[PDB]
């Protein structure tokens, strides 16, 4: 039963790297999975990793005693500006435990009720923008969602106002970040790491990290003086670690600011953009979700309890994140020598990559309609098998903002369904842009206001 | 000293799932385009390297470093072709023995003797088309298999297959086609002892008995009551040993010449005729030369040699779709290929002829265009760039025979008929181990020229 | 072994002041005449070496040691041509990808399909000149851009620019010349980030949006129904034989820009120069009109007839020899090497082939390099390798080389069949430089030979 | 992340220099590198340099367009008697290119075939010395390796016989040379170089230069009264500069003799002593290497082709030089302003130090057994990353005698294995002497003759 592993086409000494010379490597890795099956080895000069696609092996890989979160080659490149932050640190690094234990209070159900007022602030700015568009104008979905998601993490997390809705081009922070993340991804597919074309890029990459830092330094200075708040930033500057009694390193706080601004708005914006794309393509689920939102949101502004009662909006959001997980992959390594699936041996340190979009299209778990957008699959949250739905990672290195994300998207998805009717006037054909995360590109809509007031 | 590209592997099956199609040669071409001039191809128990460039092929065609290898494909046809000229190792007792006995039959001097018999078959083909009614059409590769099988029969063994007296194919042809398909299907077969293939084994033996049944028929018909290729098989003595051929090898040599001596020629004329009806200016230029040179009721031996543009058409056809699409080599001694690839003694190479003939560095960016005028001066062409007939001492013994036949027949077709591609035929290339267009059909308007 | 010559230096600005003219290529041609076959040219951050002799150019055209480079000029054009065929590095994914799918659009078989569309544009030019009143004259480079732009539009994208229905140039060409001239003027700027160039940056971006508003017009008019078999079909539907994929939406956008520009701008300059040499060299003009009268026996010329205008092509070859409308191409050193056995080069060092200077090497062409003698091109086989390089070199040579010559012959053939041309002004040749070359203010008068169409 | 650079404890106006107030600085900087990571700045009165330890940054520093070889304060002190010779000259100095192009012919694998005969001479003297020991005696490894490596460079390079095996104390040349090298290192720590404490050392340094020059005069004169030869010394006197036609300065020619006598024997003996240390400590690799040696060395004297065929022998030598690179460091500076690792900016001219033993101890490259001597690391030589194994420097200023050194070390180590079994009768505990190179100190073994004739 110990069998050898499939492997895609190899190009001499470059091994499989030429296959990653595309603008959409994750959809390219998905296509490789369909041709090679549940698992295949991917070799590049110096690196070797195995890609997992079935719950059968992914449930086995998620045993935290045998496998631990690995920094994929992608995360090492994101680490050049996020450093030893919660996302790009090793589990055994002193700043992971230290930072994890200090910042977890900020995402407790106790913390969420304080954030709700501020999330409604930005949510009203987006509705107010859409109510003030003229009849001929349209809406750029991912651009207005990035306005909303970035402004939200700034106000709830750091009491800093990017004021993105007063900008008609993207915010200067997001442009440098987007280019830095695109650089991170292109460094993966990069053959010569000194070729004449790639010398300028480190000039631009250096310029783009400085712009991002000139902002976090602006956040720290804007706090130093201008006060009274118990934010995520308050725990960062003042929180001591219960296990060691220490506050965060000065260098770590700046690395943490970068982490939460990036990881805390980039993937949520894709989620909302994908979620809204699926609704506009399935008008029965859209009308059913629009009448739940009409039912629960009876005040001019939504309350915290009302958001938790949008069960169908939550099922819509989950079915969206099932098909296109905006954080599309996470990695593990082999703590010790072991056999995976009783067929594949691993030496200690071997790297595994979870393909969340491939896992979420496993026929063995989801059935025949895996490519259909059926929010009705999430009426049985308990009936869903173990390790079959993992858009938020696994285990102790899972996404800390999972409840924060769900609350923000539901609130915002709720008010849009309550306040607008949406037309797919272009018959948008889905084109999924890939930085390291996923979002629909050039997706546009028109929104007829139902002229329901705010406050 | 570079590492070699390799297509997707499927664990213990390696690359074998990739050639699990009915058309393996065209699949290796699509892999050559993705992986380049050379790639490794592993199947359980076998490993071979496929070459695509003149640069590397010119080194593989070096007779001191590489020798003819029996690819896995030829090892399977050896179940009925045995140690005949095609399926023998060069060092086998029967190779040079048969080679030395049979080569006299392909001199430009036996060829003149064959011409009368080629015209016989060639006139039967014209007459079949001239007797078609107005709505009828021609199944091209089927009528070509009629002609070439009859021709190697009459010239080689003084035996009449009478293929034009048959509406269905000839029973020998049916068994030969099934055996060649089995040989090709065995290459891609995962578990070969599975019950799915049990009928195939009993049919494969039934088809060998049929081919041998006709070989008994051919030999007895000669014991009954010439100086042809069969006279030499029975009567020739090898100058090196003074002994004639074993009766077991004789049967294998007849099988070889009946197969290799009509299957590739039938595909060739069908491809040549395909490109002509697809390129009407080349067709008028060729039909004008046949009108010019062929002034008698039947063409003479000298006149065929004067069909120079017709010969260029045939050469340009066989460049694009060489009907024997590959030949195999092994290493013989440890060597380095092209200065980057080390090879151990015995390692196997396969020449992908359709790919070599598509080398833009040799033929230009119009490699897929049908321009017979590239062969206005064949001596200008690099060596080892055009290999439709193999290489070296194991090259095709009958290429002067084929070219003479293909010219003779193509010349008379262009002289006596106008050809309409009345169906807008879309090229579909069927693979046994050889290549042919499959459903290729046309209509033929007779020029009402007597014979 | 020999130090390399360099012209006068100006402090920290190095040689940059020397090209602060409207005609930088003609200024470099002059520097080459004093400094010889190769000289080094320094700018504040960059260094380049200019080659002028066939002796050194044959080595630069050696692809094992040198590959195509993006000069500072092309790096600036890459700001609106992007990843297109012209401004891509050969080691970029999109080059080989776009080359393999678009190369078929220029195979001889396609020329026969384009030929009908090419004739459409040319007939419009003939009848435009036939409808001029007696006192009026002809602006040569102005009507030639009308023709080549409309031709690449019809042959490439099935899009009608309708330039002959236009006042002054089309908005694309009007916007493109500013974008190309901005690119040329950025080469003289000591410090670009200076505030004085904000009007220039604003105007440069405003012109980029205009050109894209037209590629978007072309794409939208196509996917609104679509069985054409043109170059744009291959951009949208063809898949790359090596990778199995088709082109990016982003890249198809970059190639449309690429082909509209380089595919009419150098052709228009070519034809204007040929007509200059014809009206200035009345012996060659009569021989060219006597052949055109001979071969063009039909109301419209056929593909077969244009391929037989041998002397007309020889004029075109001698025109582009003297004034290659794309005046230079750039190369860099794959790895450390010695050029000419005399000058060592580090890996990546930049070379520039000065094409008008290469074509004036008296050691190759003889002592009459300035004479317009079409008969050097009678048996092209005598021409030494790498002495006549108007279309670039190697795998990065001009892709539309056959497309252009055929278009140029067809139009030049018909003008000569239908007209005698008077150089009524004694035009003194003035070479305007965008990044390409064209004669500026060339005018002629044309008396119709009154032959119908 | 455009970071600030770590730096060990500072001591006011002495900066970080007090931390290098040891007789073994490289192992002390190794101790700091392990504590501070891939890079740290090191300040002394007037000097500052940044030390690199990871292949990640060393891959960037070995880029010849961005960084060029620098003469560290250590090499500037060796310049006091080696001058403008190949080792202590700047790349942009006129003599470097000149002397480099004329002497590079002397290290051609065709020139190697000429040396094989002469290298065998000295190597035979080593075996015969050990075959003539009485039973109780033992072998002092680094003294006999230096006896051999010096004899090899003298006979092969200059046709001069030190006859180091016909003496039982070190050669008069070697003692002053070693004192000159120790002096150069010790100047790197002086809180004030004009204190009277150093006055004897300043006279000894001049005394040691005069003796080395007194021998350099003997090697040129003994050739004056001969021809002939076509050795390394012939190329120095007669070789013309290919670009300018000038021969070497007779004041440069002397510096070049000094250079090759030092660099061409000092690191080779340290290598052989280390290689022999690891064999005698890893007894099964010793048996695997002796079997290969018995198999390949079938004649009384070894041939050139046979040395190239001692494939495992080369693997042992390589793992030796990986663990303890006998030239432990080389220095670089910043041609132009650039950013190192995308985190550390550098001004033009700022200096870097590549710490070879730490580079050869990177877990990212060699795995989790980086401290174990597994010669099987060097079987697929292409499987080693680039700029991961740099015992011979980098680029155009890499060690010119690389193929020369390996041919000696392989040849001599081959004959030792063929003719002797080695007993580590003391369980020697490794103590690393540091001049400017590395050698094991007091390393001793006893050798039983395998009684194979010569
Ligand atoms: C704020 C925020 C928000 C959010 C959201 C989200 C969404 C929508 C999606 C997601 C996801 C995710 N995440 Fe998320 N998020 C966040 C966050 C985070 C953090 C901090 C992290 C890391 C943690 C630790 O490790 O400690 C994550 C995390 C995460 C993950 C995992 C990673 C790995 O590699 O393992 C995933 C898959 N996230 N996410
Ligand atoms: C009778 C006849 C006819 C013919 C034809 C032909 C055509 C059309 C084409 C061809 C081909 C060929 N061939 Fe050919 N053919 C023949 C034959 C033959 C023989 C017998 C052989 C074998 C030779 C030897 O080896 O000896 C051949 C052979 C041949 C070849 C080779 C193969 C290998 O394996 O190497 C080729 C490629 N073929 N071919
Ligand atoms: C369409 C068209 C038309 C044309 C024309 C022309 C004329 C008249 C002239 C010319 C030219 C040229 N081109 Fe030219 N053309 C074109 C195009 C093109 C393209 C696409 C290109 C790119 C190629 C590559 O590969 O890169 C070119 C290209 C070209 C060139 C090259 C550039 C470099 O830098 O190398 C040259 C020199 N063209 N050209
Ligand atoms: C004879 C000889 C021998 C030898 C050996 C040796 C061994 C065993 C080791 C070694 C090493 C070395 N080297 Fe050595 N070696 C030599 C040498 C030399 C010289 C001359 C030099 C300098 C070069 C140039 O730079 O030019 C060296 C060099 C050398 C080096 C470098 C230094 C720097 O700064 O970079 C090193 C690291 N080496 N090595």
mmCIF file of C-alpha atoms in Angstrom, chain A residues 21-23 196-197, chain C residues 89 91 93 248 332:
data_model
loop_
_atom_site.group_PDB
_atom_site.id
_atom_site.type_symbol
_atom_site.label_atom_id
_atom_site.label_comp_id
_atom_site.label_asym_id
_atom_site.label_seq_id
_atom_site.Cartn_x
_atom_site.Cartn_y
_atom_site.Cartn_z
ATOM 1 C CA UNK A 21 4.803 31.388 -14.211
ATOM 2 C CA UNK A 22 1.241 32.587 -14.489
ATOM 3 C CA UNK A 23 -0.870 35.355 -13.056
ATOM 4 C CA UNK A 196 18.188 42.358 -15.641
ATOM 5 C CA UNK A 197 14.385 42.706 -15.525
ATOM 6 C CA UNK C 89 12.311 41.095 -22.880
ATOM 7 C CA UNK C 91 13.099 36.108 -21.385
ATOM 8 C CA UNK C 93 6.701 34.769 -20.570
ATOM 9 C CA UNK C 248 -4.080 37.829 -20.991
ATOM 10 C CA UNK C 332 23.034 43.646 -24.281
#
